[PDB]
Structure formats: C-alpha cells, structure tokens
C-alpha cells in the first residue's frame, strides 16, 4: 500500500521534471544575450537614519513612498519621514525579539512580530493621538519570520513552524492556514495583483499559494540551501529568491522553473534580503558580507555594489515610486540610496 | 527655512530624548541566555532564583538580570540563535542524572560563530541525586570510555572535563558550577561570572583588553 504510493510520489516527481525539461526550449541568458548591460549603478547614501540602539532586523516602506518603518532589537518600532530623517513615531514593543514588520498599504496600521509567536497590529491613526496595539494575532507555534498586509483587515504571515497563515484582523483568527512546507518558512511577499503569494522555507523550496482557496499552485526547488528572502517581480509573473547558498535565483510562474541563478565566485555568504527596482531590471540583494549587490536581472551581470554598513545588512526595500532603496543592518542604522 | 513643520522637528527631538533615556535604562541590565535539555532544570534555576520565548528577571546586588529561556522555540535554531548575539553570558545547564543530547548541544553552542567570545556559565544540575545514580549504576552505563573509579568526585569531574573538552576557542571561559538542587547560591555564581565579564568588557572599551 504505502510503498506503492511512495513509488507514485517518485513517478509524479519524474512527470513534473520531464514536463519542465520539455518546456525548457531556452535559457534566459541566451535570449537576453543581445540586450545592452544596464551599466554601472552608481549610488550614494542620501540619508542615514540613526536612532536604533541595537540590531535592525526589518524595515518596510509606506505606499506613500516617503514614510518608513524599522523594527529592531532595541525594543522600539519607529517610523521615519525619509525625506527629512524626522522620527514621526516611536513605538515600544511588548517583546523586543521582533524579526519582522510591515506598513499597511493605507498607512493606517503597522504590524510587527518575532520570537514571541505573535503578530502585533498597531493602530497609528488613533483618536487619542498615541499609537495603540489593536490586536495580538496569536496561534503560530513558531517565531514569526515575516508578514505583509493585503488590506487594513487582511494580513498574511510566515512562521518558523513551516506554515503561512492569512488572518482576519477584525476577529483575530486564521482565515486560511497554508500547510505544506517541510522546513520552516523564512520570507514572504505578495503578487502586485494581490490574489496569490509565494513563500520561501529552509527546506530550500519556494512555492506559490492562492490567498482565497489556500492551495499550492507550484513549487520551486532549485536551491542548495535554505531560502532567506523572497520577492515577486513587478509584473507578478516571476519572483526572485535569496538563500544561504550565496545565490539568488529567478523563477517564472508560467514557466514553473528556474530562469536564472545569480552568482559570482567571490561571494560565499548567504543573502538575507532581496528586492527589485520598479522596472524589474535590477535585483538588489543584501548579503551577510556587509554590502548589497545590484544584479542586472536579465543578464546576471553585477552592475554595482552598495557598500557602507558596519554589520550584516538585514533588510532591504525599494520605494513604490522607484526613487530610492533603503537598507537596514545589524549596525543599527538604515541608509537610503539614490 | 521650515514652516510650522518646525513643530514636527521638535517632536522628532522629543522622540530622540526618550529613545536615549530608554537606551541608558536598558544598558543598565544584564542579559543571560538560558539553555539546557528538557527537564534538566532550566526553569528550576529561576524557580529557586526567586521567580514562545519567555524572559525572566530578578535583581541581585544592584544588577538587574534578564534570563531568556529561548529553549521553548521548537524551530530551526540556526535561523534565530543570532538574536542572542551580544548577550552577556550563556547560562547553559545540564542534568547529571540524564545526557549525550546535552553534550551535542553544548558542542554546538560553544563553537558557534556568534558565541565565539561569549563566556558560558555551565551549571551541572541535580548533583544530589546524581550520587544516588552513581552509587547504583556506574558512569560506564553512559560513558563506557570511563577508565576511572566509580567514586563520586572523579565521575563528576570526568563529566565536567568532557563538557569542557568541547571548547575549541581559547578566548572564552566556562564558569562550571554544580547546583545541587537546593541552590540559593546560583545567583552568586552568576554574579561573579558577570562581574568578571563586565570588568573585561570595560577593559575592551578602554583598550586595556
């Protein structure tokens, strides 16, 4: 009985692999071969956002493209006016072990969580004028590795217990749990059209979920080590991954297979964060060796380097207007680059 | 020249003042990462010490101690252990009556790249009932390699030496102590260890060490 369906698991895996090789009539590097390189990406830190007293783990831009968030080991979740460096709020956490944070697409709320196995939603636009914890989203059995807002009432999260979950903030309950990673989940993001999302895990597999039904549509397994960072491509047809194997990899959802791997022989440390530029031409990757490298995504030609941190660059984000990239680090300072 | 946004700038300075105040308050406390096997006495040490991740705290000789029992995370340790880089010390403890899982965990902790310089306050717990064990089931039942007498002191010293043999970097010290389950002196052991650590860190800051 069970041996037969183990053999059937092998057979289905071979069917999937044969289909994937059947569709592999080209490799992205040889169809983009005629494209000119993007050139040198020269950039300078236009702001240094001092104020944290310990490791910065996560930051996230506001959709207004000017405000900003920062969660840190210092116990403060503080949000910035990136144009002026002014700290428009400073929020004390109930627990200081926060690994992730997110700014709501409207700006009315900001979320945060970590080793406390809880996602905390903070109401910023309060009548009393202060910032209040509006609900504690409890129910994960592992550290909250990542989180992102769908809308002011729906938030999806990635946990260190190998599950993602989508929450109803009004009731504070999981509307849909996404079981199916064998390792624990690390990073998460949303399709620009918002109907489906991908999640990376330590079993080196990234896979696509639909938010409504909760079924996995495809799984991607080209990595040799745990995947630390995930990011959808600006058009929702592809996504990029960062891993401890020191490579970033690009996957397309209708191709269902790896389109490119980003590597250079000198880099021997894992990626902690990743993002694209507004056009998707640049893949900006944050590495443990104290710098970010910007990859010509259509070429895998490394176009520039954002050096300037005294500790691991822990998080990375690009403004929704595409003007700037913010890099957070274990050095306790963000920097904003143009 | 700023418009009435000078009020927002003034708010920013007011924020910064309390960030600085809370930072000065927080640097005034000592952080201990608490580790060990299940039922080994991780909780018992603080239970005798007057009190997801669970932080525990108590004051002693005008130091404020915060002990984090991160062992509750049944998840990938390599992906969150770096949260505790820059704790003052590790309060690793083991139950003598148990074993080899403790030694494996101790080997992993001592030689982690994050804890390269972080000293370990090793507690060999349950030292009382370990006597009842050793008097009836010699240590060869757990270390068949034990070419020594079934005497109490040498057996305990052999276990201590086997734990300390996992230490591969000269630049850290292991403040091994035995807890005996009546305790009430564990706080003093931790205090002496953190006094040495605080002095050493001051010397690092001054360039003296």
């Amino acid at each position, epitope marked *: 009985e069970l041996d037969q369906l183990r053999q059937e698991a092998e057979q289905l895996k071979n069917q999937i692999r044969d289909a994937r090789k059947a569709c592999a009539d080209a490799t992205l590097s040889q169809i983009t071969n005629n494209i000119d390189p993007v050139g040198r990406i020269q950039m300078r830190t236009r702001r240094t956002l001092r104020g944290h007293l310990a490791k910065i783990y996560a930051m996230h831009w506001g959709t207004d493209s000017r405000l900003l968030v920062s969660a840190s080991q210092d116990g403060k979740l503080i949000i910035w006016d990136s144009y002026t460096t002014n700290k428009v709020h400073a929020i004390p956490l109930r627990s200081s072990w926060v690994m992730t944070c997110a700014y709501a697409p409207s*700006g009315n709320y900001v979320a945060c969580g970590g080793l406390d196995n809880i996602c905390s939603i903070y109401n910023l636009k309060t009548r009393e004028g*202060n910032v209040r914890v509006s609900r504690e989203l409890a129910g994960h059995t592992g550290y909250l590795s990542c989180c992102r807002f769908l809308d002011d009432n729906q938030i999806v999260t990635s946990s260190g217990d190998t599950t993602c979950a989508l929450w109803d903030i009004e009731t504070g309950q999981q509307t849909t749990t996404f079981t199916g990673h064998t390792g624990d989940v690390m990073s998460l993001s949303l399709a620009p059209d918002t109907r489906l999302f991908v999640s990376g895990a330590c079993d080196a597999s990234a896979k696509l979920w639909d938010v409504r039904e909760g079924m996995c549509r495809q799984t991607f397994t080209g990595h040799e080590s745990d995947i630390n960072a995930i990011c959808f491509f600006p058009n929702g047809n592809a996504f990029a991954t960062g891993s401890d194997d020191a490579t970033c990899r690009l996957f397309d959802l209708r191709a269902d297979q790896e389109l490119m791997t980003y590597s250079h022989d000198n880099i021997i440390c894992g990626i902690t964060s990743v993002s694209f530029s507004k056009s998707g031409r640049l893949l900006l990757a944050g590495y443990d060796d104290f710098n970010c490298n910007v990859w010509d995504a259509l070429k895998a030609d490394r176009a520039g380097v954002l050096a300037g941190h005294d500790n691991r660059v822990s998080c990375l984000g690009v403004t929704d207007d595409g003007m700037a990239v913010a890099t957070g680090s274990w050095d306790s300072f963000l920097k904003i680059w143009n | 020249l700023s*418009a009435e946004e000078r009020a927002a700038l003034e708010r920013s300075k*007011a924020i910064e003042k309390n960030l600085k105040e809370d930072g000065i308050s927080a640097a005034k406390d000592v952080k201990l990462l608490l580790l060990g096997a299940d039922n080994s006495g991780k909780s018992t040490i603080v239970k005798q010490m007057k009190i997801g991740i669970v932080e525990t705290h108590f004051t002693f000789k005008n130091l404020h101690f915060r002990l984090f029992d991160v062992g509750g995370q049944r998840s990938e340790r390599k992906k969150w252990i770096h949260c505790f880089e820059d704790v003052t010390a590790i309060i690793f403890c083991v139950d003598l009556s148990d074993m080899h899982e403790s030694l494996m965990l101790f080997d992993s902790i001592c030689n982690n790249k994050f804890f390269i310089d972080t000293s370990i306050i090793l507690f060999l717990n349950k030292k009382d009932l370990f006597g009842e064990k050793i008097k009836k089931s010699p240590l060869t039942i757990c270390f068949p390699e034990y070419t020594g007498p079934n005497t109490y002191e040498d057996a305990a010293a052999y276990i201590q030496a086997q734990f300390e043999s996992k230490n591969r970097s000269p630049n850290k010290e292991i403040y091994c102590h035995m807890t005996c389950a009546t305790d009430t002196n564990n706080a003093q052991v931790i205090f002496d260890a953190v006094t040495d650590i605080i002095i050493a860190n001051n010397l690092r800051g001054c360039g003296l060490y």
Partner: single-chain antibody
Amino acid sequence: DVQLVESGGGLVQPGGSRKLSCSASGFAFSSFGMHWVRQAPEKGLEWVAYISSGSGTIYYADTVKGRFTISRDDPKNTLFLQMTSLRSEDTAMYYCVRSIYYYGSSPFDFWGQGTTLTVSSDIVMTQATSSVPVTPGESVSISCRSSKSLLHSNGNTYLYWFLQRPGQSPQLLIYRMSNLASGVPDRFSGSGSGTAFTLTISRLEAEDVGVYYCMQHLEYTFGAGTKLEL
C-alpha cells in the same frame, strides 16, 4: 471620549487679572501642543497662545504678548492661561484647542467647550461675503484669500477650514486646503492656488448651517467668518 473642558469664567474689573484652566481628558495630553483662541461676543475668531508638547516653545499674539502667559501641567493634563492687566479689548470666549504636529497630522483637530471672560507683517485672511442664503440639497462655494501665498517651498499650502454651528464650538473641516478631517462627511472639499482658496459643499444638509472660518498656519489669523442661513 476626548474632552477639552475649560473653567474659570466670570466678571472682572479692567486692569484686573484672572486665570482660566482647561482640563483635558480622554487623550494623550502630553503629546499635544495645545492652543488657546478666543471669540469676541459678536465677532470672529482670533489666536491667543500656543504651548508645544513638553513646553519647548510658546508663542503669543502681539496684542496679548507680555500680558497673558500660558502653561501646561502635563501630569495633571491641565492647560492654564494666566491673564494679567486685562483691558476692554480682552472680553471674549476662550477655546482650548488640540494640536499635534507630524507628517500627515491634523492640527487644530479638536476644540473645547470654551468659557466667557467679560470685563466691566502678519498674514491677514479675507472672506468675500459676511453671509449668503442657502437651501438644503443645494451646493455652495465658500472662499477666502490671504495677503501672502500659503504655498510653502515644500509643496504644502497651510490653510484650514472650520465650521461653528450656532451654539457649538468650532470643528475642523479641511486642513492644508485639501485633506478632509476624520469625521466630516465627504460633502466638503477644498481647493486653492496659494493666494486664493475655496471650500465647496455639495448636497447641503439642514444640520450644516453655521459660520465658516478659514485660518492660515504658515506663520504664527482666522478669517472674518461667512455665515450660511437656511
């Protein structure tokens, strides 16, 4: 809920002194740079004083500087105005006003009940008419202009709109000429071109009739106040 409630009104002789106190409750008082503004018993609004959060900055109107002094007792959530050497021009009803300043905030977003005090280079705001008749269900346009352009170099233009229903304290409608205040129905919209401004009302409701004041915030002055009539 949020309250700014003042006390200490009454009669005084000219040349005397009196102190009025504002007991804030229901909101994080320490974080707000409260105000004080006043209304002559048959005239419009005017600005009196401003004490910031943490008392780091206080300003006054030139006609009151040196004679009044305002203090904030944060541990008691109480705002004070010590008025000394009163003059006949100082009789009015004084409103305790809320404010908090950060990117995207709404200053002047709440007002107290107010108390009566009766005695035995600035940018000036102008309004085109003192009153106009209206009917429910119609649409109307309020307008006012300033002696200097309120469009600051950063792109914001600092103009506010308030509506005093008869027998009620003012309420904020619009801030920086376009942002509708939280709680005001979407009947109201604002627009302008730096020096000239307007407030547009669509589908007017019978509960909307009152006086409309616009107020600049580019530098430390209300308009005269246009009054709608059913």
